[PDB]
Structure 1
């Protein structure tokens, strides 16, 4: 229900406590990075495949990355 727009803020809101997980759904034309905190689900719609890859890399070690 909350979407973030800038990768730096998404990274910051996923490199925090309460980050239970990050779902990643690849669909036609885009990827969606959904991080589950306590209150709000934060979502990011990303377009560049290599940049999406860099984010995939940049998730903090430990945060369970589901791939669907």
Structure 2
């Protein structure tokens, strides 16, 4: 497993062809976005409520999205 820091790098990874699904995990602190790729699971931590929503709406329409 690997962590992603900036939002844009998560955007390109979720747009990868080998990306299969995105899991959204809600914690009491932040919101974790996990995209399952071929070799690694990439996790990005969003500490902002609206940035989580903007990320949710701006995801690629072709990728599956799951709520955890």
TM-score (structure 1 length as normaliser): 0.97
How does the TM-score come out when normalised to structure 2?
Answer: 0.97
Runs of 4+ in 1 over 6 A off after TM superposition: none
CA deviations 1:1-39 (Å, max 9, x no partner) are 111100000000001101100000001111000000010
Superposition RMSD on alpha carbons, in Å?
A: 0.6
| DSSP 3-state at the match of 1:9 | helix
CA distance in 2, matches of 1:14, 1:63: 8
Aligned length: 68
The structure with the greater share of residues assigned to strand is 2
- 1:62 deviates by 1.7
Specify every segment of 5 or more residues in structure 2 that has no aligned partner in the other structure, as ranges. Answer: none
Identify unmatched segments of 5+ residues in structure 1: none
